[PDB]
Amino acid sequence: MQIFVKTLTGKTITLEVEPSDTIENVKAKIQDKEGIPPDQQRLIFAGKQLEDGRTLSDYNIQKESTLHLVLRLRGG
């Protein structure tokens, strides 16, 4: 199924995922696509900050849900 990832920045990528995919498993996919390493990834869905040990289905994240990627703000 597909889900979207928005970010305070500007990007808005789409991911091919599975209801059973864990959060960690999702952070990885975000890496391959944008190059961002997981240990710096913060994910939020519908008011909830996601935890690595849980699946997408645990969070009731179904197709077309939009996750928000929180990245530590850089300087200019």
Binding site: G35, I36, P37, Q40
Partner: protein, 135 residues
């Protein structure tokens, strides 16, 4: 079609902000070459081996045709792998990442693929100079 300079700046970011595995590090050999031709790299020995617990310092030459053409690697720190010349330290152009090399490859993938040959797909602990022994 991304110009060499910008591809390099792209990899420079990842290298300086550490966006990569802790086993490897890469960056400019010096902040004066505006062309970013010379780069230094590092690979800490794989765990449980003669390699285990040691930092390998390498030299990466990103030529004017990088990344269309692979870069030139060379072990600074003395070491003893096969694909590397026993006297110079150059990583032979036949090494799978060097040959086969594709634009999509990066100094990151290079160092990793190079760190795999370590821990030697076997036990090949050869016997290392380790120490401050340098090529």
């Amino acid at each position: 079609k991304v110009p060499r300079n910008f591809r390099l700046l792209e990899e420079l970011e990842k290298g300086e902000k550490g966006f990569g595995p802790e086993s490897c590090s890469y960056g400019l050999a010096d902040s004066d070459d505006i062309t970013m031709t010379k780069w230094n790299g590092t690979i800490l020995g794989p765990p449980h081996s003669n390699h285990e617990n040691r930092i390998y310092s390498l030299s990466i030459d990103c030529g004017p045709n990088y990344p269309d053409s692979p870069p030139k690697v060379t072990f600074i720190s003395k070491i003893n792998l096969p694909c590397v010349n026993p006297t110079t330290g150059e990583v032979q152009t036949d090494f799978h990442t060097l040959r086969d090399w594709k634009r999509a490859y990066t100094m990151e993938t290079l160092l990793l693929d190079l760190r795999k040959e370590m821990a030697t797909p076997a036990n090949k602990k050869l016997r290392q100079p380790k120490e401050g022994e340098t090529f």
